Amino acid sequence: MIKLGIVMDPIANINIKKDSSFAMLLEAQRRGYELHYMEMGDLYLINGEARAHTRTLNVKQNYEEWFSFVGEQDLPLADLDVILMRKDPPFDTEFIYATYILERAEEKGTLIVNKPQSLRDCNEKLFTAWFSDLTPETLVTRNKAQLKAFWEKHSDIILKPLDGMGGASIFRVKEGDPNLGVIAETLTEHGTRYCMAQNYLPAIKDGDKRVLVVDGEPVPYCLARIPQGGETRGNLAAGGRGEPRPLTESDWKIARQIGPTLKEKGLIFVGLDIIGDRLTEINVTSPTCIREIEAEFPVSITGMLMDAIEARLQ
Amino acid sequence: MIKLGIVMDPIANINIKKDSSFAMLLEAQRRGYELHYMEMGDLYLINGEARAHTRTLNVKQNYEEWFSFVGEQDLPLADLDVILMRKDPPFDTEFIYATYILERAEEKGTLIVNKPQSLRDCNEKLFTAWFSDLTPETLVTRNKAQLKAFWEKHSDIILKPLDGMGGASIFRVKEGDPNLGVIAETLTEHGTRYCMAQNYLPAIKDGDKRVLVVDGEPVPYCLARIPQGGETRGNLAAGGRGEPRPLTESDWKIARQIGPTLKEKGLIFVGLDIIGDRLTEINVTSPTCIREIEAEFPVSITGMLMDAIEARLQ
Amino acid sequence: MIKLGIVMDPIANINIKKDSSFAMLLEAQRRGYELHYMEMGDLYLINGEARAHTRTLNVKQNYEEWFSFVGEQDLPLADLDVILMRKDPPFDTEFIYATYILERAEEKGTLIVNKPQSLRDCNEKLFTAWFSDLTPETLVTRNKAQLKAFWEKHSDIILKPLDGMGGASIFRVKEGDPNLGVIAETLTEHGTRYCMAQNYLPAIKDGDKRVLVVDGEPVPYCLARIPQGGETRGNLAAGGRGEPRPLTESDWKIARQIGPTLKEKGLIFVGLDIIGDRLTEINVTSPTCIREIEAEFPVSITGMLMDAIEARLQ
Amino acid sequence: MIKLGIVMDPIANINIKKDSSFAMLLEAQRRGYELHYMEMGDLYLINGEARAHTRTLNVKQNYEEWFSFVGEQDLPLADLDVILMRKDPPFDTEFIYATYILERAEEKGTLIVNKPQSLRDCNEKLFTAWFSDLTPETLVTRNKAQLKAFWEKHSDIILKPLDGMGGASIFRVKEGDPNLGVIAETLTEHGTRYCMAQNYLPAIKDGDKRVLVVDGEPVPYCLARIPQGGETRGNLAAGGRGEPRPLTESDWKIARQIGPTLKEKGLIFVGLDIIGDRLTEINVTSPTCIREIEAEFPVSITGMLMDAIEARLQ
Ligand SMILES: Nc1ncnc2c1ncn2[C@@H]1O[C@H](COP(=O)(O)OP(=O)(O)O)[C@@H](O)[C@H]1O
Ligand SMILES: Nc1ncnc2c1ncn2[C@@H]1O[C@H](COP(=O)(O)OP(=O)(O)O)[C@@H](O)[C@H]1O
Ligand SMILES: Nc1ncnc2c1ncn2[C@@H]1O[C@H](COP(=O)(O)OP(=O)(O)O)[C@@H](O)[C@H]1O
Ligand SMILES: Nc1ncnc2c1ncn2[C@@H]1O[C@H](COP(=O)(O)OP(=O)(O)O)[C@@H](O)[C@H]1O
Ligand SMILES: N[C@@H](CCC(=O)N[C@@H](CS)C(=O)NCC(=O)O)C(=O)O
Ligand SMILES: N[C@@H](CCC(=O)N[C@@H](CS)C(=O)NCC(=O)O)C(=O)O
Ligand SMILES: N[C@@H](CCC(=O)N[C@@H](CS)C(=O)NCC(=O)O)C(=O)O
Ligand SMILES: N[C@@H](CCC(=O)N[C@@H](CS)C(=O)NCC(=O)O)C(=O)O
Numbered sequence A, B, C, D: 001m002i003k004l005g006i007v008m009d010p011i012a013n014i015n016i017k018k019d020s021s022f023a024m025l026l027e028a029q030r031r032g033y034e035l036h037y038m039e040m041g042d043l044y045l046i047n048g049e050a051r052a053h054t055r056t057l058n059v060k061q062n063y064e065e066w067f068s069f070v071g072e073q074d075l076p077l078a079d080l081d082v083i084l085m086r087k088d089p090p091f092d093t094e095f096i097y098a099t100y101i102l103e104r105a106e107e108k109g110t111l112i113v114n115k116p117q118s119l120r121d122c123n124e125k126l127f128t129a130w131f132s133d134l135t136p137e138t139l140v141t142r143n144k145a146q147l148k149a150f151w152e153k154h155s156d157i158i159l160k161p162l163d164g165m166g167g168a169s170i171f172r173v174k175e176g177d178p179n180l181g182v183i184a185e186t187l188t189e190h191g192t193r194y195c196m197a198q199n200y201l202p203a204i205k206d207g208d209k210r211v212l213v214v215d216g217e218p219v220p221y222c223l224a225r226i227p228q229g230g231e232t233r234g235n236l237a238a239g240g241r242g243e244p245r246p247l248t249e250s251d252w253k254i255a256r257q258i259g260p261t262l263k264e265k266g267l268i269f270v271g272l273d274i275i276g277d278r279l280t281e282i283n284v285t286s287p288t289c290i291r292e293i294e295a296e297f298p299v300s301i302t303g304m305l306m307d308a309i310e311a312r313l314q
């Protein structure tokens, strides 16, 4: 059968109602694949051979017991046909070291979703620099002076870190905010770290849309994430409310401009974030929102993904 | 003329007797290039255009005053013909973010020494995994159990981090050492970070040889670094004593097996570390030892480097 | 009744077989006290009044369910008669900030076990400086030069941090160890942090004895902790094997020399560590070993503690 | 003569125009004291005896060369009559460990300015809890829920950390600020660290007054620090503009209510911060502003301090 491996954060701590790695494993099992579970500490390199202690996994939609390990073994990763790299951000050096280990298996012919070299090339915030015609005004800098000047030009800005996801450290500096100085000292760590500033997009009130792309093809329904109450963050992670919608026509236009690059670079499962008609980030590590969209519409995103994996393995 | 830029750690704090970035700038000036100085905080991205505040530099071998800035300007980095990325390790995410900024200039046709994509692909310790036939026995793992077992098989091991240089955190765990447990808990941070173990190479007593490669071509004399007194580290940084030597015949054999890969990947200036006949690491960020070799032998390594840059620009 | 509060690490994550805070709560409940549970985040200060969100607790020796909250409330801490500060190390600034909050309640007449001012005065490693006649040779320094010289004088030394417990970072540097330099650079963080060196005590082979002192009175049986296998640490936390013993006559002599100071300073429940006839540290924050001693001998340490609390409240 | 020691941050890096430790050393030298210079790494403990490598210091108001060491020696600290602890914040555990070392010298009869036990008892922000009748409304908490509620009650609040000085991390959350959530997640590190909230005091527009107290006696002129431009921080450190003034009558009233406690606790040199008629913090580690006040008025604060030291030594 196909043997699929998954590197992910502890399965014992996921919420199977929302988790997309889990929805993918139910579909792989429904198709008859042998599932091999791994966490970051299980992978290693011995004389350049990527190997791992895996546990053969069995999953089921049961809220008392959703997984069971039916055996364990140490194998070379080149023994698996597909490895899904579903480790959550932050993008740190540990994450990078794991992609070199996954890359030694990929040279022995294992398919890696997503491709290790592209995970290091395409940072979720800075890859927008390759599509500046679709993004808001974006400045990446360490200097408070440049941040102050971008604020004076735009009046209302969003300042963010480059490594997190889920609304980690998002500040909005509107007109008359008394805190530009301390927010820049906090995000650049007194000018020793880069941060990103973007002009604020009022359309966030209509939702931050997560648009999913399966091997360059946009899935036709998205999830708009509406910030809630006293929150500047649309992220479900920061309490945002999700609303499944068909793609609007500027959603198709952005997703098709990016689609071919993602295919070309082996970024087989990608989550675009679109606010209004601007692209704000590209999630290539562990994008979610599969469950919410799939509940509301007749589309099997996990099926699309396994179909694309199986074509890639032919 | 050629306009060469350099991104480096503060020039006001270098030792011009030992520093190789400085020796390279004296040669570029001797050839008539216009030098533009940058530090990491000067580079930025505004709508995907890489730009920087540079300072036009003038250097001279004077220990009271070795540099002067004769002007400053904000320019797009694509205005320079060559940028030397000479920032010192650690390999951290800031270093990675800078390579995406240098990569936007490289797409507009600037030559980057070394190539930004290869700086992210070739970590100084883990790139040895692509030449395991030339390295010692090497294990990269988070698990103390695997480290203990590698120690029982080899008796005498070297344990190290993956990010530093200069002898940062090198432990030797010889037979009967009472500390394997606490050294593994310290380097893997209780199993949450990968570390590297290698079998100890007795030949370190004859020196850790720094072998320099200029665009795939090995420079014919090396510097052997001899550990001093009560030191397990050969590194000049950890007090090692340097001895310039001709390359021996296994030095030629290793350097030629790696030479073509480095050329192919745009790793134009590389420092190999060889102990005996084993490759232990590949320094691609800011390798030094140019001064010491050049003092003792009739070879101009900086000249070789500018000749290779000028060929690359043709 | 007496209302006793406890500040501790999450009760949902303790092992009731070994945990001493839990054994103390079963005894307080057996005596009829009302138990109020708190974690560090529940305590606060509003205009200098110490207050907390507590949860009224019910505990029982049941491995499926060992606690239940039967209500919650926000109260001033001065409403409780006794607060047991049982938060585990590290000794960090958060720990110190909590002692000022517990100190505002103590001025309104609540008994704090142990006394907040003494928790800040008596660091578990450096308080041994007030009894240097009972300790091994001890040097606290940031300088590798002094560490090297102490090693040359003593041949076999133990190097440790000042903040942890449980065998955190204990190195033994015996004769001919190739790592003094990197161990000193690691514990002093290149000379910016103090560490402690002590001469190694061969008697650790007979056990690191935990001697418990209840209001200056030594409990008459101790637990010797024997290091296991390839371990330099006797700590149960680092796999040490515990053996309950009567106190030997040098155990009585040390415990009585320290007894009156601990009483005097309101350090009502203290865990001395004795190796042979030398005192190595004084645990005043959350000392354990009550269960193991009590299983083997006819002594109720928790009873001694509640008797001392009740006398203190008279 | 009197031998005075000073523990301070590197003298080679101070600005003698503004630095108050330096102004104190010129006065001690003018009186004929022998000055012994120390940095944190020079102090150590060997079997509970506090000792240090000192350098005999000579200072002079010369901007090319303001200090010279005329010898060095290792001595027990009990050999000095007075040690000025002038190390700058942060208040971290290293700072605390140094106070135990200074405390072993103090038991052998050395005067420590300020007293080590009081430096650990009187944190610069939380010691205000002992004078809540003179401070603004102050909440110290880890819970965002309590911070949100304090903001709804007061409309305009100041949120700050407990460890820094100089305007480190001061946020103002006025009505309609879109960032309460991310500022609380940032200062409490997702609820794992305490932070302080206070209601905003409009009077900061007239200056944050530094009021100096020499052994319980208020010095009669203060320095008001006016925030500048786009700054919420009055601190000279964050660009604030200083204006020497006589004490107003509510400045006398606050300083006299605190004066006797500071004397009583051996906090011989203290810098109160007063905004309007509210006390906001008490700087006991390294308060400055001596130069600016002394330039404008006929008062020798350093003289007052040496007079108080000499009385303390009688
Ligand atoms: N330019 C913007 N305009 C408005 N809101 C933005 C903007 N950029 C980010 N945000 C807000 O911050 C949240 C997270 O931003 P995002 O770029 O997607 O980073 P993250 O990885 O944390 O999700 C968004 O959902 C939105 O609420
Ligand atoms: N396998 C080995 N055998 C012996 N010594 C080694 C070995 N690996 C590293 N070392 C020692 O540690 C020093 C640094 O090792 P290296 O791999 O080059 O890391 P770094 O980047 O810090 O220079 C070497 O100069 C040598 O002294
Ligand atoms: N002087 C010493 N001689 C021998 N072993 C020691 C010595 N000091 C510490 N140790 C070892 O390290 C372990 C922990 O040391 P300790 O001082 O008690 O710190 P901790 O708080 O981590 O328990 C001890 O149980 C013992 O095994
Ligand atoms: N309650 C307050 N009202 C207004 N401004 C305040 C208040 N508390 C602090 N600040 C501002 O922040 C600056 C620093 O606050 P402070 O409490 O003195 O901390 P620090 O140690 O950093 O000086 C003050 O100078 C002032 O500008
Ligand atoms: N691993 C998780 C996803 C974790 C996560 O937060 N992922 C980010 C991108 S890496 C995301 O898609 N967040 C969507 C949101 O917060 O709305 C899952 O599969 O559910
Ligand atoms: N930037 C410095 C080099 C800094 C450095 O230590 N570089 C490492 C590799 S990134 C090195 O070559 N070290 C040689 C040694 O310590 O012997 C220079 O040009 O001199
Ligand atoms: N809170 C825990 C104790 C946690 C702990 O490890 N405490 C240290 C001192 S703070 C200890 O006594 N350790 C004994 C050992 O490891 O043997 C309990 O009550 O069991
Ligand atoms: N050590 C320095 C003082 C460093 C410092 O910033 N101290 C703080 C208190 S610890 C201070 O008084 N700051 C006054 C201000 O920034 O206005 C000196 O003597 O000048």
Ligand SMILES: [Mg+2]
Residues within 6 Å of the ligand: A124, A164, A165, A166, A281, A282, A283
């Ligand atoms: Mg994201």
Ligand SMILES: [Mg+2]
Residues within 6 Å of the ligand: A166, A167, A273, A281
């Ligand atoms: Mg997003």
Ligand SMILES: [Mg+2]
Residues within 6 Å of the ligand: B124, B164, B165, B166, B281, B282, B283
């Ligand atoms: Mg190196």
Ligand SMILES: [Mg+2]
Residues within 6 Å of the ligand: B166, B167, B273, B281
């Ligand atoms: Mg090396």
Ligand SMILES: [Mg+2]
Residues within 6 Å of the ligand: C124, C164, C165, C166, C281, C282, C283
């Ligand atoms: Mg302990």
Ligand SMILES: [Mg+2]
Residues within 6 Å of the ligand: C166, C167, C273, C281
């Ligand atoms: Mg101990």
Ligand SMILES: [Mg+2]
Residues within 6 Å of the ligand: D124, D164, D165, D166, D281, D282, D283
């Ligand atoms: Mg202050």
Ligand SMILES: [Mg+2]
Residues within 6 Å of the ligand: D166, D167, D273, D281
């Ligand atoms: Mg202040």
